[PDB]
Every structure is written in C-alpha cells, then in structure tokens.
Enzyme design. Structure first.
Site, mmCIF file in Angstrom:
data_model
loop_
_atom_site.group_PDB
_atom_site.id
_atom_site.type_symbol
_atom_site.label_atom_id
_atom_site.label_comp_id
_atom_site.label_asym_id
_atom_site.label_seq_id
_atom_site.Cartn_x
_atom_site.Cartn_y
_atom_site.Cartn_z
ATOM 1 N N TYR A 216 0.798 -1.229 0.000
ATOM 2 C CA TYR A 216 0.000 0.000 0.000
ATOM 3 C C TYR A 216 0.836 1.287 0.000
ATOM 4 O O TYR A 216 2.027 1.262 0.310
ATOM 5 C CB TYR A 216 -0.988 -0.015 1.174
ATOM 6 C CG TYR A 216 -2.126 -0.993 0.966
ATOM 7 C CD1 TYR A 216 -1.898 -2.376 0.936
ATOM 8 C CD2 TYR A 216 -3.418 -0.534 0.707
ATOM 9 C CE1 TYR A 216 -2.936 -3.275 0.642
ATOM 10 C CE2 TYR A 216 -4.452 -1.414 0.414
ATOM 11 C CZ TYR A 216 -4.205 -2.780 0.378
ATOM 12 O OH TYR A 216 -5.232 -3.632 0.044
ATOM 13 N N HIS B 8 -3.652 0.198 -8.361
ATOM 14 C CA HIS B 8 -5.066 0.336 -8.103
ATOM 15 C C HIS B 8 -5.485 1.624 -7.413
ATOM 16 O O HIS B 8 -5.179 1.838 -6.250
ATOM 17 C CB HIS B 8 -5.551 -0.877 -7.288
ATOM 18 C CG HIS B 8 -7.035 -0.933 -7.083
ATOM 19 N ND1 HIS B 8 -7.645 -1.924 -6.344
ATOM 20 C CD2 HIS B 8 -8.034 -0.131 -7.531
ATOM 21 C CE1 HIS B 8 -8.951 -1.732 -6.344
ATOM 22 N NE2 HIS B 8 -9.215 -0.652 -7.056
ATOM 23 N N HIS C 26 -0.896 -4.424 -7.230
ATOM 24 C CA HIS C 26 -1.058 -5.870 -7.260
ATOM 25 C C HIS C 26 0.056 -6.317 -8.190
ATOM 26 O O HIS C 26 0.028 -6.029 -9.385
ATOM 27 C CB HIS C 26 -2.416 -6.255 -7.848
ATOM 28 C CG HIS C 26 -3.568 -6.001 -6.929
ATOM 29 N ND1 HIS C 26 -3.845 -6.804 -5.844
ATOM 30 C CD2 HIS C 26 -4.511 -5.028 -6.928
ATOM 31 C CE1 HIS C 26 -4.912 -6.340 -5.215
ATOM 32 N NE2 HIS C 26 -5.334 -5.263 -5.853
ATOM 33 N N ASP D 113 0.918 -12.695 -0.167
ATOM 34 C CA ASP D 113 -0.092 -13.725 0.038
ATOM 35 C C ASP D 113 0.342 -15.180 -0.074
ATOM 36 O O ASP D 113 -0.020 -15.992 0.771
ATOM 37 C CB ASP D 113 -1.295 -13.458 -0.865
ATOM 38 C CG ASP D 113 -2.017 -12.168 -0.495
ATOM 39 O OD1 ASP D 113 -2.473 -12.054 0.659
ATOM 40 O OD2 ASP D 113 -2.128 -11.267 -1.348
ATOM 41 N N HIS E 64 -2.861 1.205 -3.862
ATOM 42 C CA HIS E 64 -1.883 0.133 -3.689
ATOM 43 C C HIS E 64 -1.605 -0.503 -5.045
ATOM 44 O O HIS E 64 -2.127 -0.061 -6.061
ATOM 45 C CB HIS E 64 -2.450 -0.940 -2.760
ATOM 46 C CG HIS E 64 -3.770 -1.479 -3.218
ATOM 47 N ND1 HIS E 64 -4.940 -0.758 -3.120
ATOM 48 C CD2 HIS E 64 -4.091 -2.630 -3.856
ATOM 49 C CE1 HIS E 64 -5.925 -1.440 -3.674
ATOM 50 N NE2 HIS E 64 -5.436 -2.581 -4.129
ATOM 51 N N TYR F 272 -9.036 -10.235 -0.165
ATOM 52 C CA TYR F 272 -8.805 -10.389 -1.612
ATOM 53 C C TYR F 272 -9.034 -11.800 -2.127
ATOM 54 O O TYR F 272 -8.665 -12.772 -1.475
ATOM 55 C CB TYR F 272 -7.359 -10.061 -1.979
ATOM 56 C CG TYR F 272 -6.751 -8.894 -1.256
ATOM 57 C CD1 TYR F 272 -6.757 -7.620 -1.818
ATOM 58 C CD2 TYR F 272 -6.147 -9.085 -0.014
ATOM 59 C CE1 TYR F 272 -6.166 -6.562 -1.150
ATOM 60 C CE2 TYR F 272 -5.564 -8.033 0.646
ATOM 61 C CZ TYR F 272 -5.569 -6.778 0.085
ATOM 62 O OH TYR F 272 -4.968 -5.757 0.778
HETATM 63 O O1 LIG Z 1 -4.050 -10.738 2.773
HETATM 64 C C1 LIG Z 1 -3.181 -10.242 3.421
HETATM 65 C C2 LIG Z 1 -3.048 -10.280 4.950
HETATM 66 C C3 LIG Z 1 -4.416 -10.598 5.577
HETATM 67 C C4 LIG Z 1 -4.676 -11.835 6.172
HETATM 68 C C5 LIG Z 1 -5.938 -12.098 6.761
HETATM 69 C C6 LIG Z 1 -6.956 -11.131 6.763
HETATM 70 C C7 LIG Z 1 -6.704 -9.897 6.169
HETATM 71 C C8 LIG Z 1 -5.438 -9.624 5.573
HETATM 72 CU CU LIG Z 2 -6.580 -3.687 -5.586
#
Ligand SMILES: O=CCc1ccccc1
Ligand SMILES: [Cu+2]
Ligand SMILES: O=CCc1ccccc1
Ligand SMILES: [NH3+]CCc1ccccc1
Ligand SMILES: [Ca+2]
Ligand SMILES: [Ca+2]
Ligand SMILES: [Ca+2]
Ligand SMILES: [Ca+2]
Ligand SMILES: [Cu+2]
Lengths: 720, 718
Positions: free
Chosen positions: B363, B683, B520, B377, B518, B460
């Site tokens: 971000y 984004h 991606h 992720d 942010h 996401y």
């Molecule tokens: O997705 C990235 C870190 C995260 C993990 C679990 C919930 C919200 C955000």
């Molecule tokens: Cu986005």
C-alpha cells in the site's frame, strides 16, 4: 405437399440435430431454439408449445416437413428476440426504397452523368439534440429525412444532398482537388487493363511467367510523395502488384516481385511500369483452405439458450439488461453504435451518443519499388462497410449468436443486402465478482457480456471488431486481425543462403523464398461520449510517488496528480497505461461528491507487439498526411462534419484534413461537448506460425465508469 | 429404489427434465447422460448403456436403483478420467505420504511437542530423469523424498525424509528465519485481543460500546531496520481491527488509527499504537445479496454431449497436441509440469515447470495503520492452503470439470480441497479466417483449454488461469476481486473539510470510507525448455532506420537483434513494443530460424498498469523485493530457487529471492534458463468497486516464434 427436412433446414441456415435415443430433432436458428418429435402435433419453440398444421413425417429414415413448416415455426412469435418498431428511430439507416429514391433525385438533375458512380449514399444526421430528445423524451424529430449522396463523375467528387421527405434535391457541390475512394469496378478494370497490355505481358514473360492469363492483379492506392514517385497529382491512379495463380487457391503465396504497373483509371491504360531485379516466383502450392489437410476429430460443443435471449431487437434498437442502444450500418466505416444509455434504477443516463470505427491504416516499412508506397486506409479508400464478410455461423461467432442482415447501396446506387453482416451474442465471461470469506458461505455471480461483432475483408486482410457491453457499465472495443500476409518474393530459401541477410532486412523469412514484410496495423475509434450529458471536461490523473511528509518509517507515498486538459492541442497525446484519463461531467456528481466520469483506456493490451506510434521518420509524407497515427488519445469539440481521423478524402491527399485539422485551432475542451478518438495499433514482425494463414491477433481498448455510479453496479435491486 | 433428484444432487450432478421429450438430462463434470423413464437403456456421452433397472416415475417423482450412479457414472462410457498405472514422478505427496513423512519426523527426539508444519511437499527428482519419464517412459530410479518444513514455536527447521525407504535424511534448523503465518495464528490474534483489558480500553475510547464485536486481522509487519521499534527476533503480527455490525461485512467498518502488536510466542499484545480518533463507518454494506433481488435471466448452457476433448490420467492432462502434468502446492498452488507440444507425431519440450512464483500487494499510505502493509499472500499466508473451492457454473463455466486436490494442513494432517481447480475448454473466436472476394470462405474456430485456480487471503480473492491455445500459445491471466481494504475517514463527500486530506492516498469510494491506493504485483516462475534444455535469451527491438536503398522513402522498419548473455542484463523492464525470445540455438525450423518462444510479461489489463514498484528505492520493501521493479528476469536453472520474494520473506532483512538468484550475474548463453515474469497493476479505487470489486484482469503470453514451420492449426497433411 412436403419437402425433405434436413436439406430445407440447412438451406434455411438452421443447425439440425437428430437424437436417435430420444427420437427428437433440435433445430437452432438465431434466437430460435426448437424441439420437435416425428409425428408430434406440437413442437417447442423457446420453451413454448406450438401447434403444427402438419407433423414432421419420418419415412425410411428420412424426415419430411410441410412447405410451411419453416414459416410457421421460425416466424411464430414464440421467438421474441425481434420485435417490430412502431415509431421509426431517427438514426435508422436509409432503406432500400430511400436509397433508390436518392438515386432517382440526383439522376433528375440536369448535371448527372452516365458513368457517375456512388462512393457513398448515407443518411444525413439530424441534429444531435433532436435525436437525444427522441431517444430519451420520445419527442418526434420534425426535421426532414435527408441523405448525403457522394458521387464520382469520372475522377471528380460531387457532394449532393437530397430531401427524401419532400423528394427534392437540396444541393450539388463539386469538391475540387478531392480524389474518390476505390470502387469495386476499379478492381476488374485493373485486371482487364493488365490483360490487354502488350508491354506488361512482355514484362511478365521475362520474369519467368509463361501464361499471362494466370496473373492476378491487386488495386493499391499510391499515396502522395510531393512528386518523388513521379506521378501526376491530378490523375486518378492505382499501382498494380501481381501474383501468379498456381491453382492452390492462394495466389498471395506466389508474388511476382519487383514489377509494378501504374494505371490511370479514366484513361483505362497503364501509364507506367516500374521494374526491378528478377526474382523467381515462389511456386510451391500453399493452400490454406484445408484441401491438402486431414480433418481432426473433435467432440461437439454447443452454447445454448433454450428459452430465448436476454436481449430484444426492436427495429435497429437493442435492449439488454440496463443497456439501450441503436445499431446501424455505414458503407465506409461499418457499424455505428448510437444513443447509448444505461438504465440506472429507472433513469436512463447518457453514455455515448455515437460511436464507430473512425478509420485505420496499415503502413509497411520496406523501401523497394513494390512496397514503399504501401500504406492502406482500408475503410477510407476501400469502404469496409461495403466489403463486409458474412459471418460464418458457429465459427466466426459462437453458436449462440444472432446474425443480422444489413442493407447499404453499392457503387451503382442499387440497394445491397449483406447477409449475416453483424453478429450479436451474449457470453459467459468468468465471475462478475467473488468473495469467499473464510468460514462463511461463498459469494459469486457470473459475468455476462453482450458482443456486437463485425468482420470486413479488404483484399488479403480480414478484420474483426467487437463492441463489448459489460453488464457493469464498462464498454470494450477489440480489433482482431487475420487473413493472409502480404509477402515479398526473395531468393533465399533459408537463413543460410547468401541473400538471406539482405532479404530479411525488412521482414522475417516465413517460408522458402517468402518474406513477411514488417508493417503496422493502426486502428482509430471515434467515440462521441456524452457522460451523463453533453458538457464534459477531460481530466488527468497520474499516479505518482511523492516523498513522505507525514512522519513514520516510510520515505515515500503513492499519490495522484490531478489536472484538467483544457484544450484540444493538449488533449492530443500519447497514452501511458500507468496513468488515468477521464472524460468527466463537471455538472453532475455521484453520492460521494465526485464528478461522474468514464475512464478512457486506448491501450488495454494485445497479442502482437504494441505500436507506440507510427514507425516513420518525422519527415515522411504519410506521417505528414496522417497525424492520428502518432497519438493514442485525441479529444475535439463536437462537430457533425468531423468523423474521420484520416480525413474525408484521403486518397492521394496532400495535407492532413483529419484529426490534425480538427484540432488545429486548439479549441477549448472545458465543460463542452467532447468527442474522444482512440488510436491503438500493433507492430507486426512475421513468424512462420502465421503462414500460409494467420491465427487471429487481438488488441483491446476499454471505457470504464469512474464514479459514474455510487456502488458496485451489478449488486442488484435494493430490497429496502 | 431411491429418489433420483435427491440422490443425484447429493452426488453433485445437475438434473434436467424435458416434459415434451419425456427425457432426463444428467450432467456432472465429464459425464453427459440422457435417460427416459421406463427405458431399458440410457445414453452416456453419446454411447448406449444397458440398465439393470429402468428409471421409474412414482407420483411425478422419478426413482432409480440404489446402484444407478455407480452403474451409469462409473460405467466407463465417460472417458474423461483414465487410470494411472505408472505414477508420474511429479505427483504431489499423497495423503498416505503426508502421514508417513509426519510420522518420520515425529519419531525423532528433536521433534518438540507443539511443532507445526509450514509446508510438506515433494522434494523434486532431478529434471533429467523426469523428462525421460515423460518422453521415454523411463522409470525414475530415485526414492520419493519429501521436504518437511517445521515451525517450532517461532523456530524454522528443515527436514528431508526418504518416503520409499521410510527414513529421516536430514534435520536442519534455519537460523534467523521467520515462519510464514499459520491458520492457528489467526485465532490467537483474535483471542489475545479479546482478553486484552488495555485493548478493550483503547477500543472504548474509540466509540465501540461492545468490544466483543471487534474483528481482528493478522498482518505481517515487514522490516524497517528497527525504525518501527520492533524486535527483530520476536515472532510478531500487527492487528488491524473492524467492527462487526451484522451485515456480514466487517471490512466496511474500519477502526482507524488503532494498531496492536502481538507477540505470538508470549501470546500477548506488546505494543498498542493509537492515532487520531475517527468514528467507525456504521452503515450496513452487505455484499452477499441479503438486501438485493437479482433480475430474472434466461438460461445459458455450454454442453459437450459426447464428452471432453481432454483426458485426465491421474494428474496428467492430454488435450489436442498438448500434454502436461497438474499438481498442487500449499504455498503457490497449481504447478504445470512436463509440458510438451505434439508436433505432427513428435513430442517437443516447451516447459519443464511453471507456476506462480510469488506476489505482493503493497500500500501507499504512510499513516500508522498502513505504512507496514505489504502483503506476500503466497509467501506469508500460503495461497494453496487458502484455495477457494470453485462455485460450479459461476466461478467457471457450466462445461468445466472440477478437480479435488490434496495438501497437508499446518498440523500435518491431509486436507482434501474440493473443486480446488477447474478445467474447461472454451470457444475463443475464430482461430483464423480469410474470405477471399467471390470465393468460398475459410474459417476455423479457436479453442482454449483453461486451468483455473482461485485462492482467497483475507479480503482479496485471486483467480489464475493457465490457458493452452491449440496453436501452441500459452496464456497466463490473473484476476482480482473480493473486498477492498479501506481507511476510515471523517469526510462523507468531497465537499467536506477533511476531504482533501482524507483522499491524499486514496479515493473516497463511500461515506467515511477511502480505498487506499496500492499495487497488485504477480510474478510467474516459468522454467521453459524450448525444444530442449539449452537456450539463449534474444532481444528483437523494432526500430526506424534511414532508407539506404533509394526511392521516395526516407526511413524503413528494421529490427535490432542481439543476445542477452547474463542474468543482470536479463533483469529488465519490458517494452511491449519490443520482442524478447528464449531461443534454442541448437535447433531451427524449416527456414533456418532458431526455434523460439516469445515472452510477453504484459499483454494487457483492465486496471492501470504498474511500470514498476511505486516506492522510492530507499524504502525497505523495495530493498527486500527486487522482483517488483522489473517485468522480466532470466536465471540459470537451480532446483532450490523457486520464489521471487525468497524462501522466508516474513520480516526479511534483504532480498533472498530474485535479487539473490541473479546477484551472481551468471551466463545465460546456451544453457538451462528459467524465465520469471513480473506483471502488475496500480489500483486507484472508485465507487463502482465497493462494497465488492468486479473482477479485474491482467494478461501475459508465451507465443511460439519460428518454433513451427507453418500455421500450427492447419492440420496434418493427407
Ligand atoms: O491478505 C493479506 C493479509 C491478511 C490476512 C488475513 C486477513 C486480512 C489480511
Ligand atoms: Cu486492488
Ligand atoms: O487492403 C488494402 C488494399 C488492397 C485491396 C485489394 C487487394 C489487395 C489489397
Ligand atoms: N511408502 C508410501 C507411503 C504409503 C504408506 C501407507 C500406505 C500406502 C503408501
Ligand atoms: Ca476543433
Ligand atoms: Ca460528446
Ligand atoms: Ca543464478
Ligand atoms: Ca529451462
Ligand atoms: Cu499484420
């Protein structure tokens, strides 16, 4: 009496399926999905029962139907895809009768000529405001139906306007210094002239060709070179590039390199023959229709909508979900999408008043005698609407498509109906949105897109254009290219031969003695977007990294530089896919106080390398004559007479009468009626995979609602 | 007998009744069945089947034999799936192997009581042997081995086990390496916060009357060389909270400027950072349709009544000229292996292994609750583990086949992910076309085989499609949807006092809600072997050169071709106007051109494109993840270099991924190369993307370039 079912239905253009286990026939034709059993008194059309006056009869394994079956079934009314227009839309293209009426009116003129051909006969656009009033308020257009009649008297252009309502001629204006586009009869004229040329036959003979009767010509525009090409600007000329017919159905694979004939049309004679080194004609048979190929077994796949379509076609107007638009055909640029609105909970909001292909250009980069002048403006110089290629049902468009016929006038002023001229189809396009919250029930909805597809073939190139209406308000426009490449005959069979290096300086060696000369495909779309109204402003939003001034560990932050582009001059620019460009309506905001806007994306991707602009030194005439080639975004003040990026009469044009002209006065684009022009293209460096026939290559553009709505557009109707 | 509709739907099959035809159409994955009540036979994928017991109608309710599903669906007439008699060497660890591996390490005296497993995966056999199995049916004479990565508290230990001989081969503690976040860590964070008097106190201060409605999120903290005041040796996670208001969407209710730092081993908050108080956005913003009514739509079906054109043998997929192996990994998800193209009878190598390398969603807001927000992720949360089962007919077309995949969970127990991957063929416009004026038309339709996988990490949802075109092209698309991470702000519209400041780092997409800007960034690891192992990277830049041949033209279109001989030079920005090829200098097509594949890291996208990392080169995230700033990378094949962000990216102090893999600047001349493609988006939000974001896509492409001698789809010569 009766007729054989299969034959008759195929003739009719319907897909016929017989299920032996179910003893059931399934018939499909556009919006009609039919099921009928032999001997049954009724049939099913889009889920509804239909009583037949004559049941399908099965005799010795052969099915037979009444001669009224097709009419009773396919025009029953149970198929509601098409509805009759009760009040004619003001933008409806000229009808067959109107075309004939316009032709009669000009022929009543004491000045009309016998050899007078028609480059274009199209509806004269009523004023924009009246049309919008009709579409939104349903107010009648009390202005008379008029038509523009552009005639070619020999080599002279004449612009005439006829009043169809009062059947009277309103104007007859000769256009000096203007050349007319290429017409269908010119094609035959060239071949005929070459066939009667004693010299050309001699020229061809010395180049290894014995039977000159097997020589196939092509009518190419010559462009403008301030005389360096040694061609009188005043004459109506065309250069002729020839190929040899070897009987493989693909003469494009047998170039007669270094032989160019200049033909003067009115004089119906070859006025010049340029000759270069003799190159043996590539003879090897290279068919592309599959005559020499094995047909692989493939299992069937069908996309069906058994209860009908989600869209309705009333006259030329299409309604689909929240969308409403008008679709018509023009002989020069093809399809025209008009009065486009999006139904926002009962309120139809304006999106685009008029959209269509602006024009396109395919410039080559080989300096030799048979290529240096080659820079095609397919729609402008050849009329892509006229050259529409009928959709191959199930192949050029999915099996669940509906095919529309369109009528235009041919060059002799006679009405012409193009069968399967445009395809309309809805398609699954993955999930509209999805969210699987951990430990919770999933949430997913499918995405649907309505596609309007049109294909035009101009010689060796086959172009496909798709206008994509996304349920969420987004509008996409893709351009596909396929067909046969223009190749150069060379002496090298492989890159190991002595001349290989020189033969491949301007293109890849894609076959023995055959080179795919490098070129570009540059498309331009004229988009008269009226974002929730006519008065809009062009706004720029450039994402930038600025120093952190708020404390904490970070040294930088992601911010945006927002500014208005107040004039046409500044609006004509290159497009950076990393930036944001909006056509906003400074008079209307969404629920958060943001101006309702649409994001303009001239470059959303492509399968060939992208054209960053025109691959010409700034001192080339084509670059001079055509400025729309170098910029990807242009925005000009609305003007009903400015519709072509390359100009109205681009054939041998001496100066830019298109976008360079439309923006030369650098007018204000602040809170006024704007017209967006998107230019996108590809640079084509050939490869063997594209020969003898090229797999379809695509480029994508996009128009996305930006704060035009107050939330996710596809969430659905609010329950409370 | 047993009720049909009830039984069939429990089986997961779709049931259609046509009253006019008195016919039932049954569909499930590759099976397309037609059966009429009372008939002694049925039809399966176009072939006749004798039934023991006909289907019977009882009170307008159809009934079938209790053995109907087995007899019909497991008849053998549906040839979609074939038995695998000789297991492919890259097959993922089976449930039995997962349990064997766990028993092996648990039998060791060094295995501590509450040890968890970050990953248990197949230790890859040598590439050469695997290729020999795929191309020569030669057996791999090497015992199946498994990498067992353990997390003992906060300590990472790497072990290797011999599955064939059932023995521990190695046990190596990994110094200074932090383990990825595990599922149980999510609950800890919530429970730790729940039992925090101080936190509850802080929350009360911010307007929350019932702290029990507070929802936490487990966020990695990154590395800031201590400037964030965090101990480098402690296993930490920062907690951002939201207020549950019963609308099923806590994401729409941020508790801004409140950040708790939790030490997972001490099991307690070790720091609470408080910023200005901002009222929690309260308006219910459900995204599940509870408050909506969808418009009625006419049905659409995509059917293949005779079955599929592809066959699935174990995990090997055969389709047209393509042959490849599909397996699942808990960290990066699907892996496409031993991909060959059958060129008129001869299988030619294309890609040894392909998969997601890694990805990051950083971000651009400097404030207390956002500055550290940089999500990896797959690397930090394990996307394969968080695979989201495909919603049949919606996440994938109605003609898809849904595959189940098995991985091990963090406790070492086998976990079967239902409908983990979707396989489906689709019409993709005309393959090619030419309508010669006045001649019969020539058109052939294009077909694409898509392998789709969806993973969801928090808010996401990510979609990945591996697309095989009949003509030899391979596409890789990445889609993004789900719920945006928003910042609570005071402004309701852009006319409010704080509006300008509230939107400095993001768009105001709702009242008091700003969608923070942010990026991606996805990175794909593609071990391409273009018609062989030894390849070279070749650049072809289209250029305008002065005309030297004479005539009116002043310029010409020529190409600037040159080789890129080393890793450092191969790490570069991608100009979509240029051409980049991975060629095999040892093989040529019929015209004498080196067989090659064109690499296209950026073939399009629906969101603004990311030209690189939107970070100053002195930011730590930038230093830690070099892969974000270049779209193309090419390194020498190495079995242990598989992640662009490095093996252990959690709170990493330096680049152990692509930065390390290329640091050496080794030769890329005629050798085994591995291509890494970085493609990303920037984004900047809008109202249309809230409360739920319509799927946005990015596209990449790998095209054969003089790999063949002609149009690949024309067909074999008679
Ligand atoms: O997705 C990235 C870190 C995260 C993990 C679990 C919930 C919200 C955000
Ligand atoms: Cu986005
Ligand atoms: O398409 C552009 C010019 C042209 C027209 C007809 C045949 C070949 C080429
Ligand atoms: N040695 C392979 C692992 C295994 C263990 C138990 C049953 C089947 C297979
Ligand atoms: Ca102007
Ligand atoms: Ca406008
Ligand atoms: Ca290396
Ligand atoms: Ca390799
Ligand atoms: Cu081309």
């Amino acid at each position: 009496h009766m007729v054989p079912m299969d034959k008759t239905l195929k003739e009719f253009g319907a897909d016929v399926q017989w299920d032996d286990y179910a003893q059931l026939f399934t018939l499909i034709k556009d919006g009609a999905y039919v099921k009928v059993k032999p001997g049954a008194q009724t049939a099913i059309v889009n889920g509804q029962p239909l009583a037949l006056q004559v049941p399908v009869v099965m005799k010795d394994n052969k099915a037979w139907v009444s001669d009224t079956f097709i009419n009773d079934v396919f025009q029953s009314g149970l198929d509601q895809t098409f509805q009759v227009e009760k009040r004619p839309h003001p933008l409806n293209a000229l009808t067959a009768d109107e075309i004939k009426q316009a032709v009669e009116i000009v022929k009543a003129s004491a000045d009309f000529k016998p050899n007078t051909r028609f480059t274009e006969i199209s509806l004269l656009p009523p004023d924009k405001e009246a049309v919008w009033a009709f579409a939104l308020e349903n107010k009648p257009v009390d202005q008379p139906r008029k038509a523009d009649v552009i005639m070619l008297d020999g080599k002279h252009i004449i612009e005439a306007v006829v009043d169809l309502q009062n059947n009277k001629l309103l104007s007859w204006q000769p256009i000096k210094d203007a050349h007319g586009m290429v017409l269908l009869d010119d094609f035959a004229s060239v071949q005929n002239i070459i066939n009667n040329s004693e010299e050309f036959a001699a020229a061809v003979k010395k180049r290894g060709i014995t039977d000159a009767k097997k020589v196939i010509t092509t009518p190419l525009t010559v462009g403008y070179f301030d005389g360096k090409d040694g061609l009188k600007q005043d004459a109506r000329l065309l250069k002729v590039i020839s190929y040899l017919d070897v009987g493989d159905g693909n003469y494009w694979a047998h170039p007669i390199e270094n032989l160019v004939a200049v033909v003067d049309l009115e004089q119906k004679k070859i006025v010049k023959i340029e000759e270069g080194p003799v190159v043996p004609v590539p003879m090897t048979a290279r068919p592309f229709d599959g005559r020499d190929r094995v047909a692989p077994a493939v299992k069937p796949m069908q996309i069906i909508e058994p209860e009908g379509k989600n869209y309705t076609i009333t006259g030329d107007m299409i309604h689909w979900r929240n969308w409403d638009f008008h679709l018509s055909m023009n002989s020069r640029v093809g399809p025209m999408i008009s009065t486009v609105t999006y139904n926002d909970n009962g309120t139809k909001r304006k999106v685009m008043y008029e959209g269509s292909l602006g024009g396109m250009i395919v410039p080559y980069g080989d300096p030799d005698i048979g290529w240096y002048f080659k820079a095609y403006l397919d729609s402008g110089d050849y009329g892509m609407g006229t050259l529409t290629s009928p959709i191959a049902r199930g192949k050029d468009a999915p099996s669940n498509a509906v095919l529309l016929n369109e009528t235009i006038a041919d060059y002799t002023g006679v009405p012409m109906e193009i069968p399967r001229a445009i395809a309309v189809f809805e398609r699954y396009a993955g999930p509209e949105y999805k969210h699987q919250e951990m430990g919770q029930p999933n949430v997913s909805t499918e995405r649907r897109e309505l596609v309007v597809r049109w294909i035009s073939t101009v010689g060796n190139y086959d172009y496909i254009f798709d206008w994509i209406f996304h349920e969420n308000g987004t509008i996409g426009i893709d351009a596909g290219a396929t067909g046969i490449e223009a190749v150069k005959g060379v002496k090298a069979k492989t890159m190991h031969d002595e001349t290989a290096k020189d033969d491949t300086r301007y293109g890849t060696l894609i076959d023995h003695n055959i080179v795919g000369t490098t070129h570009q495909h540059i498309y331009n779309f004229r988009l008269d977007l009226d974002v929730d109204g006519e008065n809009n402003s062009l706004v720029a939003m450039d994402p930038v990294v600025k120093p952190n001034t708020a404390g904490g560990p970070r040294t930088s932050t992601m911010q945006v530089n927002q500014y208005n582009i107040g004039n046409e001059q500044d609006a004509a620019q290159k497009f950076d896919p990393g930036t944001i460009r909006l056509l906003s309506n400074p008079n209307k905001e969404n629920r958060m106080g943001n101006p309702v806007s649409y994001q303009i994306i001239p470059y959303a991707g492509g399968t060939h390398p992208v054209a960053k602009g025109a691959q010409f030194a700034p001192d080339e005439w084509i670059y001079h004559r055509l400025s729309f080639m170098d910029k990807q975004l242009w925005v000009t003040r609305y003007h009903p007479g400015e519709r072509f990026p390359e100009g109205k009469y681009p054939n041998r044009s001496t100066h830019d009468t298109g976008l360079g002209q439309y923006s030369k006065d650098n007018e204000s684009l602040d809170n006024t009626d704007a017209v967006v022009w998107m230019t996108t293209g590809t640079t084509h460096v050939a490869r063997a995979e594209e020969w003898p026939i090229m797999p379809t290559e695509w480029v994508h553009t996009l128009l996305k609602p930006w704060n035009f709505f107050d939330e996710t557009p596809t969430l659905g109707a609010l329950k409370k």
